[PDB]
Amino acid sequence: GVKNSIIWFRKGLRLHDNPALLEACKDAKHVYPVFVLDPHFLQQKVSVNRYNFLLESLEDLQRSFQARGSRLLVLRGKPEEVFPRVFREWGVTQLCFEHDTEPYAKVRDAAVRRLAAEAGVEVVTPISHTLYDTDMLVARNGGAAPLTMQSFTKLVDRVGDPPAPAPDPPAAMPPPAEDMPSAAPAATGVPTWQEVGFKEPPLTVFKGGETEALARLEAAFQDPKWVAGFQKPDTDPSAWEKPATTVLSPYLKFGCLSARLFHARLLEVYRRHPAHSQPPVSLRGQLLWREFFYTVGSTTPNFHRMAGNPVCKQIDWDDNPEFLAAWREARTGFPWIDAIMTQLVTWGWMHHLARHSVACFLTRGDLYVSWERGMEVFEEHLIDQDHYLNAANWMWLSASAFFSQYFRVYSPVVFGKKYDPEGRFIRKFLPVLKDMPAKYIYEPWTAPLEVQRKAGCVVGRDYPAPIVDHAVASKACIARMAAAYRRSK
Numbered sequence: 001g002v003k004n005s006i007i008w009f010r011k012g013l014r015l016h017d018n019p020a021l022l023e024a025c026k027d028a029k030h031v032y033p034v035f036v037l038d039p040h041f042l043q044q045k046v047s048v049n050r051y052n053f054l055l056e057s058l059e060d061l062q063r064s065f066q067a068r069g070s071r072l073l074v075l076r077g078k079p080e081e082v083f084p085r086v087f088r089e090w091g092v093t094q095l096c097f098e099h100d101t102e103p104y105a106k107v108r109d110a111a112v113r114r115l116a117a118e119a120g121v122e123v124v125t126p127i128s129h130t131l132y133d134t135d136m137l138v139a140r141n142g143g144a145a146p147l148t149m150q151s152f153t154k155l156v157d158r159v160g161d162p163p164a165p166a167p168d169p170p171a172a173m174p175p176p177a178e179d180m181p182s183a184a185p186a187a188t189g190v191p192t193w194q195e196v197g198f199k200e201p202p203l204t205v206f207k208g209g210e211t212e213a214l215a216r217l218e219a220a221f222q223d224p225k226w227v228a229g230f231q232k233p234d235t236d237p238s239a240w241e242k243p244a245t246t247v248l249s250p251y252l253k254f255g256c257l258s259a260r261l262f263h264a265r266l267l268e269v270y271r272r273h274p275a276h277s278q279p280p281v282s283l284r285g286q287l288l289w290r291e292f293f294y295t296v297g298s299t300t301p302n303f304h305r306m307a308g309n310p311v312c313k314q315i316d317w318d319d320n321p322e323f324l325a326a327w328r329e330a331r332t333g334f335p336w337i338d339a340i341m342t343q344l345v346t347w348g349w350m351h352h353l354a355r356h357s358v359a360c361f362l363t364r365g366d367l368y369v370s371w372e373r374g375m376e377v378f379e380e381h382l383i384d385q386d387h388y389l390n391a392a393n394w395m396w397l398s399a400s401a402f403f404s405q406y407f408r409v410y411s412p413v414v415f416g417k418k419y420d421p422e423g424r425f426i427r428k429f430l431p432v433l434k435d436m437p438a439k440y441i442y443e444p445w446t447a448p449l450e451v452q453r454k455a456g457c458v459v460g461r462d463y464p465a466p467i468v469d470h471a472v473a474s475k476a477c478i479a480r481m482a483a484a485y486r487r488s489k
C-alpha cells in the first residue's frame with residue numbers, strides 16, 4: 001500500500017534540522033503535520049506572553065507548510081484519544097516525532113506508541129531537541145548522569161561533536177489527503193490569543209517562530225568576534241534595548257531553533273578563531289548548561305521538587321505567603337528586584353544575572369521562601385519556561401543542588417548599580433521612579449523627602465518601602481542555611 005505519515009509537533013517547531021519530518025516525508029503519498037492543542041488547557045496560571053509565543057510559532061509553521069504545498073493541522077483534544085481515530089481515518093502507516101525527555105512526555109509518548117502498535121503504525125522518534133541522545137551520555141558515563149558541569153563537559157568531549165543538523169526538507173511536501181473530515185480547515189487552524197480566552201494582550205517584545213529564530217541566529221552571528229569571545233559571567237543584566245546575550249532561549253525551548261544548528265554554527269566560528277572562549281563561559285558552554293541539566297534532570301526522580309528528589313538538599317523554607325506575594329507582585333521596595341520582576345511579567349525574559357538577583361532574593365538570600373515557589377512564578381510568565389532548566393537553576397540559586405556556597409549573597413541594592421549606576425533599567429521597567437536622582441534610585445528610601453516629592457515618588461505611597469533590611473535578612477538566611485546543611489549529615 002501507500003505510505004501515509006504523521007509528523008507530530010510538540011517541541012521541534014521548525015522545518016530545519018527535523019529528522020522526524022524528513023522521515024515522515026520519505027516515500028510518502030500523504031503527510032499530516034499535526035499539533036494537538038488542548039482546548040481546555042487554560043481552564044486549570046499561563047501567561048498570554050508564553051501562550052501567544054507558541055501561537056505565533058505555530059502560525060509560522062503553518063506558513064512554511066503552506067509554501068511547500070501542505071498545511072499544519074491543529075487538532076483539538078488529547079493525543080491518546082485523537083491519534084487512534086486519525087490513524088484509521090487517514091490510513092496512517094508511520095508516526096514521526098522528535099523525542100522529548102520530560103516526565104509527562106514520557107508517559108504520554110509510551111501510551112501513543114502502544115496505540116500506534118495496535119493500529120499497525122510504525123513509530124520513528126529521532127533525537128533532535130538536545131545536542132546528544134542523553135540516555136547514551138548517561139550510559140557512556142557508567143549508568144548515572146554526571147553531577148558537575150566540569151565532569152559533564154569532559155563526558156561530551158569524549159563522545160565528540162554532536163550530530164550535524166539534518167538537511168532542509170524538500171521544496172514540495174506531500175499534503176494531507178482530500179475530503180478527510182479530521183483535516184477540515186475550520187477545525188484545524190491556529191487560534192489567536194483572544195480565541196484561547198485571554199482578556200489582556202501580550203506585551204512581550206520577542207515574536208514566536210522559526211523565521212524569527214533564524215533571523216535572531218543570524219543577528220548574533222553578525223559579529224564573529226563577539227561570538228568567539230563571549231563570556232557569560234561578564235555580560236550586562238541591565239542591558240534591555242540591546243540585550244547582552246542572544247535571547248535565543250525561547251526559540252530553543254520550543255525548538256523554533258535547532259540546538260545542533262546553533263552548535264554547528266559555533267564550531268564554524270571557533271575554527272576561524274582558535275583563541276575563542278571555552279566552557280563553561282562560552283556560547284557553546286551555554287548550550288552545554290542546557291544539555292547538562294536535561295541529562296541530570298531526565299534521570300533524577302522528582303527533579304522539579306525538593307521532597308523525594310535525591311539531588312536536592314531538604315531545607316526548612318518558610319511558609320511566608322506575604323513575602324512571596326510581594327516578590328511575585330514587584331513590590332519588594334528594592335527597585336532592582338522590582339524592575340526585574342516587572343520585566344518577567346511584561347517581556348517573559350530577563351538576563352541570566354537578573355534571574356540570579358531575584359531568585360537569590362526570594363530563597364537563600366533574603367526572604368527564605370522555597371525555590372519551588374519561585375519556579376512556579378517563573379513557569380507562569382517565562383516565554384522560555386523550560387521544565388528542566390527552570391528547576392535546575394532554581395536549585396542552583398537556592399543552594400539546594402549543584403551549588404553549595406550559601407555565604408555568597410547578592411545585594412539587591414549594589415548588584416545592579418555596578419552595571420547601571422544611572423538606573424536606566426529601573427527607569428524603563430519602573431516608570432514611577434523615572435525622575436528619581438541616580439544617587440537614590442537603587443535606595444529610594446534614602447532620598448530626602450523633598451527629593452522624593454520633587455520626583456513624584458514618595459516612598460510608602462508611590463513606591464513601597466523595602467520589605468526587609470538586606471543586612472538583617474541575609475544574616476538570618478545564612479544562619480538558617482548553615483543549620484539546614486548540618487541536619488543533612
Ligand SMILES: Cc1cc2nc3c(=O)[nH]c(=O)nc-3n(C[C@H](O)[C@H](O)[C@H](O)COP(=O)(O)OP(=O)(O)OC[C@H]3O[C@@H](n4cnc5c(N)ncnc54)[C@H](O)[C@@H]3O)c2cc1C
Binds near residue numbers: 286290350385
Ligand atoms: C532561576 C533561574 C531560572 C531559569 N529558568 C530558565 C528557563 O525556564 N528556561 C531557560 O531556557 N533558561 C532558564 N534559565 C537560564 C538562563 O538564565 C537562560 O537560559 C538565559 O537567561 C537565556 O538567555 P539567552 O538565550 O540570551 O542565553 P545565552 O547566554 O545567549 O545562551 C544560549 C542558550 O544556552 C542556554 N542557556 C544559557 N544559560 C543557561 C543556564 N544557566 N542554564 C541552562 N541553559 C542555559 C539557553 O538555551 C540559551 O538560549 C534560568 C536561570 C535561572 C538563574
